[PDB]
């Protein structure tokens, strides 16, 4: 609704203190290690918050579409929203990492924390202190639930997976041979399936199927199909809103390509190129210069883009269904529908 | 003994490999992961292996003198060996980080993960997933034991409250200001009783308390009362055999000062010191320049260290003894003893 979901957009929004305070109050103080956890908040608050919070969200989005009148508690209410924060959390240490390895300038409207003089490459602990507040607040909100382990080795099991698909990245995009031989579709697709799906969709519907008992492995099968598909098509999405669409574009709207970015856009274009494009593209790709840049683009138009967007986003919604109506036998499906009804949009 | 100790020490060595298979076989492969999980591998066999291990092997011994003659077999000592890389591993991550922090170019002998060409940065996350492996070996060995989660939770604890630590370090020691205002015994110490002392000393004992079963909470404290010292007194000494004594000298023999490293010896000589010294080596520290680095030997010469090692060393000892003897009713002495019986010795 353009109402309620907006006011749960509030709960969770309103929370934040709380875990702030929860991270750090007692420790603001510690004759031994107050100055550190001074800072711990300081890092906490220009990190954590700052995007949209759709994924935290999520996980209340679904606790609530799962939970019955018996759990529907205040008290449950509360840890629905604390596992939430956790994954805004889990996030921050994520993206404050990738920032330095990435060599960014720009975050979410601001400078990189690593940028900020003083701070420099100390964010590396900096990250792995919010890493640890994640696991600070579900022990504080959980650990005396029958859920509390299967939540433990969610997140840690997550951050492995995600870790791994990082890993990945990191590896197929470098300009020492800058490379389009191993940007690889179904390479691309790993990295889509394991830097991002995972904590992206995953983590939160399932730690709310968690929460309320459904502890069954090949319940949590049926989820992770469906959801995957969603977490795939939401990033090549988010791939194509960024060069290939303008009006009213949220998140981040301007673009890249003078990132070797491995992007749905180039893959797809490195198929239905020749030796001619192939270097054309292969060669002001990855570079920051306004013909080029805005060369390449040409090249994707000079191979049609909007087309496999179009003969891609039409033909999910459609796989999407199915796997729905195939999976979702135990499970309401108006979840996985509120995802959809928020995440299939698109832009020409 | 010069002959069991030895051996579990060679157990313990033996069973690297298996952690090794154990954290990548299945993964090595994996026609989406696989490049990932190769890399792992390297990334664990050049970080891991390489110290003395006495850390790991410390569980080894607790979980020896610990158990009871129904608790001794095979299938309990891996996991004793198991939990035991698992500390081993913790380490790594922690000090394949702090490398890159410190832009170090050198350690345990050879060249730092960051500084092997091709890596860089990259092992900001290499650091990252060497911190998974160390649940995912617990979950693999352990996840059916009754003290599963007491050990999930001592070394996620543990982390945090290291992390802090280092977080302190980083703070306290920076040449904007280079300084050695904030260098306070009451920091230092500090600094060591959360960067090193608590996974140092602490949580290998303490993780094998838990697998007897001793859980009691006031029986962890009387735990970390004991080792808590011998883990500040450890550094210490480990403070003054890196100037101060040589012959024989194990771990790294060469030296410091180059680094501003916050160190008892300094702190120590900041308070023996006039107006004169005070500049003498607040000039001369930090600073790799054999008069200087040189030179503000002198000066801890000129006030006389090996003596406060002394009236150091002869005070701890005892502290020691009776902190035995008021925190061990219901854990064999035997243990705290060999902790003693080669972590005391010192050098003049
Ligand atoms: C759990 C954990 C702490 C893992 C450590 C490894 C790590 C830094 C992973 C990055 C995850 C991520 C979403 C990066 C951003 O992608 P991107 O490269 O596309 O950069 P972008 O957001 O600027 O587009
Ligand atoms: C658990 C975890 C992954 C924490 C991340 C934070 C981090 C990098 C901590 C460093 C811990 C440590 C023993 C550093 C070495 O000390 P040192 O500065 O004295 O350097 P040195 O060993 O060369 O002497
Ligand atoms: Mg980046
Ligand atoms: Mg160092």
């Known amino acids: 609704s353009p109402v309620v979901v907006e006011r749960e957009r509030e709960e969770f929004v309103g929370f934040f203190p709380q875990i702030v305070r929860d991270l750090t109050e007692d420790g603001i103080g510690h004759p ?21 919070c759709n994924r935290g969200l999520t996980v209340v989005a679904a606790y609530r579409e799962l939970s019955g009148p018996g759990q529907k508690d205040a008290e449950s209410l509360r840890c629905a929203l604390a596992v939430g924060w956790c994954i805004e959390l889990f996030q921050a240490a994520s993206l404050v990492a990738d920032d330095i390895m990435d060599q960014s300038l720009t975050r979410r409207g601001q400078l990189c924390w690593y940028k900020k003089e003083g701070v420099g490459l100390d964010a590396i602990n900096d990250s792995f202190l919010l890493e640890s507040s994640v696991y600070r607040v579900l022990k504080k909100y959980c650990r005396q639930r029958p ?20 890993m990945l990245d990191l590896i197929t995009a470098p300009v020492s041979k800058v490379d389009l031989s191993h940007f690889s579709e179904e390479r691309y697709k790993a990295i889509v399936k394991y830097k991002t799906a995972f904590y992206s969709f995953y983590l939160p519907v399932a730690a709310a199927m968690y929460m309320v008992g ?16 969603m977490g795939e098509y939401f990033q090549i999405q988010d791939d ?3 060069c290939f669409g303008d009006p009213a574009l949220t998140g981040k709207v301007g673009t890249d390509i ?18 001619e494009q192939r270097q054309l593209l292969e060669d ?8 080029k840049v805005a060369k390449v683009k040409e090249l994707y138009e000079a191979v049609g883009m909007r087309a496999a967007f179009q003969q891609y986003e039409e033909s999910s919604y459609r796989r999407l269904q199915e796997l729905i109506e195939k999976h979702s036998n135990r499970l309401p499906k108006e979840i996985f529908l509120g995802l959809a009804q928020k995440i299939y949009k698109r832009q020409k």
């Open 32 to 52: 031994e290690v107050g100055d550190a956890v001074a800072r711990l908040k300081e890092v906490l608050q220009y990190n954590a918050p700052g995007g949209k």
């Open 147 to 166: 859920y509390y382990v299967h939540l433990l080795e969610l997140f840690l099991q997550t951050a492995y997976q995600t870790e791994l698909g990082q």
């Open 214 to 229: 459904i502890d069954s492995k090949e319940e949590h099968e049926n989820a992770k199909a469906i959801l995957l598909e």
């Open 240 to 242: 194509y809103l960024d």
């Open 258 to 275: 003078q990132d070797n970015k491995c992007s749905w856009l180039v893959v797809q274009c490195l198929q239905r190129v020749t030796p």
């Open 284 to 291: 002001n790709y990855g570079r920051k210069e306004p013909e």
